[PDB]
Amino acid sequence: PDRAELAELVRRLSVVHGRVTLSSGREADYYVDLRRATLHHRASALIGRLMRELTADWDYSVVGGLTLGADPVATAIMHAPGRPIDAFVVRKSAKAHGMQRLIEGSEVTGQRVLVVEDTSTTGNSALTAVHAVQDVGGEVVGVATVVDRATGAAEAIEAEGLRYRSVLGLADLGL
Amino acid sequence: PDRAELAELVRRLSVVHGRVTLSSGREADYYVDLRRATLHHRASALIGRLMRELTADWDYSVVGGLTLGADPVATAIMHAPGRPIDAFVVRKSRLIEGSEVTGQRVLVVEDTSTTGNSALTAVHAVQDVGGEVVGVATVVDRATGAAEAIEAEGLRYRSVLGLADLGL
User: Fold this and answer.
1) Which residue, among A39, A112, A68, A84, has the nearest Cα to B43 in the 3D structure?
2) Are the CB atoms for A144 and A51 separated by under 8 Å?
3) A11, A25, B19, B112 - which has most CB atoms within 10 Å?
4) Nearest CA to B53 among B147, B127, B159, B141?
5) Contact B87, B104 (CB under 8 A)
6) A48 inside 8 A of chain B by CB
């Protein structure tokens, strides 16, 4: 029921129907804004729960990713029922202070880390977080995401020796 | 107990004592890394509870502020028990992500700040889109005029913690 409850909320909240002229001059009939679910009271509590179950067999104390598409997901996982898991956010530029200048939040040095994102087209953003955690001495145990969009992300993440899992898929969006 | 236990988590996770050089060149005897608290599993859960208690007499359906500092606070409030409250995020540079703020009563959040400019930016961004801001709540007030700046704009300001809870 949860996967289906979430899947429906993602469709309703995040598939934004309506015609739009892009900067290129092409028109699209819809676009996919996952931030609308990841920041919704109900969809986020489901995301938290389901991403915990999805990764239950992985060994990690810390969850995080690349701002902003990761923050709400990571915090959802942190707040969801179960064993303690802390969070972190990889920035795009360097903090003024500390010994992990691209990483807000919890100390990832010497921890096993889950890397998350709401959705990835290329896996660029996820891998940017993976390497940022890596450069500071964190063990990335895998990457997980709310929605796979079958656009190359899995094979890009798998190419660097890392597991990839998703709660939802292209079919769950309708389209 | 909740407030006392958060205070202790904020001292232990976020108040970094020792001679330090700021980005300006100024030397301080400490700095505050409030995000280690806002991204910690226990402290964030207390933040959501306590920020909800703190603003229980205000009417708002949506909570959020300027990225990154606000997002961990906004989602802790959203995930905390009680009546449903959605979240939003004001970007620095399409300004508002997440839940709709237009036509809604909105709580602007900040983890902490010396000047309140970040809070103000979020307030202004919500106003430009037809949201009504009911006030600003923060985790830590630094007693450096943030409050009064927010009050000059006709907005109520509140904090869970203050300067004295940070043992300086």
Assistant:
1) A84
2) yes
3) B112
4) B159
5) no
6) yes
Strand partners, A165: A144
Q: Where are the alpha helices (DSSP H) in A31-123?
A: 35-38, 41-54, 71-79
Torsion of CA A30, B90, A80, B14, to 10 degrees: 160
Search chain B and give the residue with CA nearest A105. B36
Residue A99 main-chain phi, psi, to 5 deg: -100, 10
Q: Residue ranges of the alpha helices (H) in B60-128? A: 70-79, 117-127
A150 phi-psi bin (left φ>0, alpha ψ -120 to 50, beta other): left
Inter-residue contact A13 to A27 (CB < 8 Å): no
- At B150, which helix (H) or strand (E)? helix B146-152
Residue with tokens 């989602």: B75
Question: How far apart are alpha carbons B90 and A3 in whole angstroms?
Answer: 29
Residue B49 lies in domain: 1-168
Residue A8: how many other CB atoms lie within 10 Å: 13
A38-A43-A47-A48 Cα dihedral, nearest 10 degrees: 90
B42 contact A CB<8A: yes
CA-closest candidate to residue A52, choices A129, A117, A134, A114: A114
Residue B111 labeled ligand binder: yes
Question: Is B91 labelled as part of a ligand binding site?
Answer: yes
H or E element that contains A140? strand A139-148
Task: Identify the CATH number of the domain in which residue B87 sits.
Answer: 3.40.50.2020
Which is nearest to B68 in space by CA: B101, B92, B37?
B92
